[PDB]
Design a protein around this ligand. Structure first.
Ligand SMILES: CCCCc1ccc(S(N)(=O)=O)cc1
Ligand SMILES: [Zn+2]
Length: 257
């Protein structure tokens, strides 16, 4: 029954998921002055040209755009990563107001939202086995700020009316996630965790420095989704973000000088 409310939110999660107080939890604040350029990072490769989206689902916590990950169709390689990581889904976290919503922060700045493109390490065969490994997942995180509209987001925005409540899904084929990227692939990276229960410490985080701009109308439509199921009291799906967690014994590395 975890969620984002006062009675089931991030400050309660540790009771059922004690790893919430672990040594490599996410998100974190990215102190840009302390992060260090790492010459050992290889070029990052986002290869999404053959992506096969399938479906969009309101899971009661966010909405996921799901991909066919039965072959190496959309993959992430390079950067800090060893081997090949296959795209399985993306989703967002967002706020009730434009001044909050991101999970990672940059010098304590909160963005209006944060996109997570979730990938699993193909050496482990399936996502469920990958999440049991310290290098099982790679999540590409992209900040959203409110300004001009992001054209490649509009197809997502326009289907949300059909998945308003928890458990609803809709066909979402032929969506191109390349339309959600910014121009630059400059990034910060560090070892962390899933940001929702079960909070497993299996993620290499790659957080892009350049945000994408989305319009006020686009993010307003995110905020019309519901956490609740159909026929239940309406609880707007807003503020579905975990705050920054202690950095502990970690260093954030930058891909750029
Ligand atoms: C075991 C199922 C895990 C699903 C899940 C996938 C990704 C994230 S996030 N927000 O990108 O760290 C959270 C949860
Ligand atoms: Zn996420």
């Amino acid at each position: 029954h975890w969620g984002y409310g006062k009675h089931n939110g991030p400050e309660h999660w540790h009771k059922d998921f004690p790893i919430a107080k672990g040594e490599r939890q996410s998100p974190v604040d990215i102190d840009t002055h302390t992060a260090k350029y790492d010459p050992s990072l290889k070029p990052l490769s986002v290869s999404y040209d053959q992506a096969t989206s399938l479906r969009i689902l309101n899971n009661g916590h966010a909405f996921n755009v799901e991909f066919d990950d039965s072959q190496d169709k959309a993959v992430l390689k390079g950067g800090p990563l060893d081997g090949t990581y296959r795209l399985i889904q993306f989703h967002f976290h967002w706020g009730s107001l434009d001044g909050q919503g991101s999970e990672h922060t940059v010098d304590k700045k909160k963005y209006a939202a944060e996109l997570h493109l979730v990938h699993w390490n193909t050496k482990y065969g399936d996502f469920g086995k990958a999440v049991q490994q310290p290098d099982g997942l790679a999540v590409l995180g992209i900040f959203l700020k409110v300004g001009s509209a992001k054209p490649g987001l509009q197809k997502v925005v326009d289907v949300l009316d059909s998945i308003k409540t928890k458990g609803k899904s809709a066909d979402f084929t032929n969506f191109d996630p390349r339309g959600l990227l910014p121009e630059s692939l400059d990034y910060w990276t560090y070892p962390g965790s899933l940001t929702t229960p079960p909070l497993l410490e299996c993620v290499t985080w790659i957080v892009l420095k350049e945000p994408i701009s989305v319009s006020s109308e686009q993010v307003l439509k995110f905020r019309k989704l519901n956490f609740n199921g159909e026929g239940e009291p309406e609880e707007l799906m807003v503020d579905n973000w975990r705050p920054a967690q202690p950095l502990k014994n970690r260093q954030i590395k930058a891909s750029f000088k």
